[PDB]
Amino acid sequence: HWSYEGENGPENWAKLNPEYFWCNLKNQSPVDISDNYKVHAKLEKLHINYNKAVNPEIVNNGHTIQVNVLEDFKLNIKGKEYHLKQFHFHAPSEHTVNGKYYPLEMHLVHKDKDGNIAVIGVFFKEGKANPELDKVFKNALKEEGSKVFDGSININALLPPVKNYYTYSGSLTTPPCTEGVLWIVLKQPITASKQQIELFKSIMKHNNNRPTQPINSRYILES
Amino acid sequence: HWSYEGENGPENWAKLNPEYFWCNLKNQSPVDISDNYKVHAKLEKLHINYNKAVNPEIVNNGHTIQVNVLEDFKLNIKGKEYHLKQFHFHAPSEHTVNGKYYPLEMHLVHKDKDGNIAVIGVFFKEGKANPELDKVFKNALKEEGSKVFDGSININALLPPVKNYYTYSGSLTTPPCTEGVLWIVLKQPITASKQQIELFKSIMKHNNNRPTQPINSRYILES
Numbered sequence A, B: 001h002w003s004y005e006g007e008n009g010p011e012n013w014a015k016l017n018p019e020y021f022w023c024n025l026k027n028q029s030p031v032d033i034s035d036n037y038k039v040h041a042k043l044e045k046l047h048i049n050y051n052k053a054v055n056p057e058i059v060n061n062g063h064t065i066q067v068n069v070l071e072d073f074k075l076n077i078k079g080k081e082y083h084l085k086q087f088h089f090h091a092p093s094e095h096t097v098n099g100k101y102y103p104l105e106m107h108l109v110h111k112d113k114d115g116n117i118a119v120i121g122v123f124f125k126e127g128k129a130n131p132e133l134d135k136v137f138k139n140a141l142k143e144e145g146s147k148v149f150d151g152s153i154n155i156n157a158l159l160p161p162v163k164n165y166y167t168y169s170g171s172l173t174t175p176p177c178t179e180g181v182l183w184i185v186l187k188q189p190i191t192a193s194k195q196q197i198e199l200f201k202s203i204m205k206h207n208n209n210r211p212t213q214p215i216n217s218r219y220i221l222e223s
């Protein structure tokens, strides 16, 4: 089984299972979003409205706290119609901006009818507490397992008002590290209280962010 | 052995050898350079001066006619210092522009000190004959083999005056189809005479262009 340290750490994920060959390729995530290879461009506007997920499932799978939604929220971008499947968290953040780590990163995982994946990343900096985050972190089991949250979560409240973003072609950040992933990282971080961030970290017991990967021949676009 | 048709055709390259696993991944070349996923941006200017290659080696390797240069022509771009190694040809072209094929495409293959690859592609449309092309095609062996050209080739004469270009992250277009390749396709095609184009095609005996591949989560930048 893979982990974020030791023999089964990120550096040896590709050795754990034949299906993890992707982890050693040339278009991996996360990456350092650097001005060195970031270019500004007129990009498609992000149109999403994740109203609210009613009675979503909160899962502790040992590697993160994930929320599986029952609704069918659509993300239409780059000629595809992706459907939100779940969002989860990483602490510290996986992506960095000019070398800077944020204390928390949320990933909204979408998939289209053909299995294509798009992930929207949201950075969280310490500050005013976020209402929705308590619903997730305080109702997450401390041990591996799932639980149905008796209530609803306003996902829009887990997103910044302005949705300018960075985008690049990458991969899943945990085995099998499949590539061909469409990454959309919102430029504006929102806030989470120190207690919310520490609660998540204390549940995980360890950092669950994959080291940044070489950008190689890719450029990152910024809207 | 792989080919451009039959059992060993492009569709089954990945089955020929374990090392060809790349041919089935998510960041393959060539691609259709489509306005649907092409974005304009301020890109690094292309600074290259491939003066002339003296006594280069002309090789017919059965899949193309390739010219190996002895000089050390540098291509400095995207934070790397690539060195020109050789240029070769494909007929019809490999890349297309909004679905349009050109009769001929030239590839200038560069590699840096770490093995990183950058390929500059040049489209040729039928028209005024190109002086340099005769040096290559008329001196290429009709059967597999190499030969040293007794003369010099002005590579700059194989490039358009204006060097605006498209760029994207891709792969080699023949096995092993390694990814992480930096592609730079010059937007302006130059000309080759119908006879020059047919001479190359008659030597090859068959089309030697790989089918275009899915762009997947990549965008193509245009300077």
Ligand SMILES: CC(=O)Nc1nnc(S(N)(=O)=O)s1
Pocket (backbone or CB within 6 Å): A107, A109, A119, A171, A172, A173, A174, A175
């Ligand atoms: C089952 C599933 O979604 N797996 C993922 N692996 N990595 C992901 S991430 N961090 O790139 O969003 S999602």
Ligand SMILES: CC(=O)Nc1nnc(S(N)(=O)=O)s1
Pocket (backbone or CB within 6 Å): B107, B109, B119, B171, B172, B173, B174, B175
């Ligand atoms: C040895 C070598 O250079 N191999 C190549 N395979 N494909 C290439 S291409 N068409 O992408 O320039 S170069």
Ligand SMILES: [Zn+2]
Pocket (backbone or CB within 6 Å): A088, A089, A090, A107, A173
């Ligand atoms: Zn994630």
Ligand SMILES: [Zn+2]
Pocket (backbone or CB within 6 Å): B088, B089, B090, B107, B173
């Ligand atoms: Zn080629």
